C-alpha cells in the first residue's frame, strides 16, 4: 500500500522531475488544508536536495 511506501524506511522513491506527478505530490504535501502524514512524508523524500 501507499501507506507503506510513503513511510517505509528501506526504499527511496521519486518520479520525473517537474512532472505533473511531481507537482501533484507537491500540491498534496505542501497543501494548506490537506495535512496528512502520508503526502507530507512523500514530499519530504521526493523533494530532498
Amino acid at each position: 500500500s501507499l501507506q507503506d511506501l510513503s513511510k517505509q524506511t528501506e526504499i527511496p522513491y521519486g518520479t520525473v522531475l517537474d512532472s505533473a506527478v511531481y507537482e501533484h505530490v507537491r500540491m498534496k504535501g505542501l497543501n494548506p488544508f490537506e495535512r496528512d502524514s502520508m503526502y507530507s512524508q512523500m514530499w519530504w523524500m521526493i523533494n530532498r536536495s
Binding site: 513511510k7 524506511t9 528501506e10 505542501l30 494548506p32 502524514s37 507530507s40 512524508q41 514530499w43 519530504w44 523533494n47
Partner: protein
C-alpha cells in the same frame, strides 16, 4: 488539541481593535501569512524529525557489551578463585603439607 490560539491583545475599547483584525484576515487569505510560516517552520529538514523508527536495524546480533554481565560473573569467579588461592598460599605454610 486545536482551536486555542495566539493573538494580539489591545486595551478595552481601543479604536484599532477592528482594524488589525481586518488586516489579519486579509493576510490570512492572501497567503502572505503562509510565507512567513514556511520561512520560520521550514520543512526542508536537514534531518527527518518525524519517523521515529531508526531505519537500519530490525533486530540484531548479540555483542560483548550486551553479553558483558556473563563476563563480569566469570571475572568475579576468577577474582574469588585468586582470593582463595592467596589464602591457600599463606595457610599451606601452617598446614606444612599439601
Amino acid at each position: 488539541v486545536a482551536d486555542r490560539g495566539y493573538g494580539i491583545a489591545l486595551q478595552h475599547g481601543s479604536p484599532y481593535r477592528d482594524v488589525f483584525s481586518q488586516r489579519i484576515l486579509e493576510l490570512q487569505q492572501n497567503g502572505d501569512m503562509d510565507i512567513l510560516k514556511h520561512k520560520w517552520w521550514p520543512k526542508n529538514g536537514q534531518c527527518d524529525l518525524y519517523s521515529s523508527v531508526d531505519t537500519k536495524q530490525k533486530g540484531g546480533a548479540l555483542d560483548i557489551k550486551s553479553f558483558a554481565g556473563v563476563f563480569c560473573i566469570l571475572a568475579a569467579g576468577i577474582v574469588l578463585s585468586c582470593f582463595i588461592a592467596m589464602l591457600e598460599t599463606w595457610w599451606n605454610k601452617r598446614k606444612g603439607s599439601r
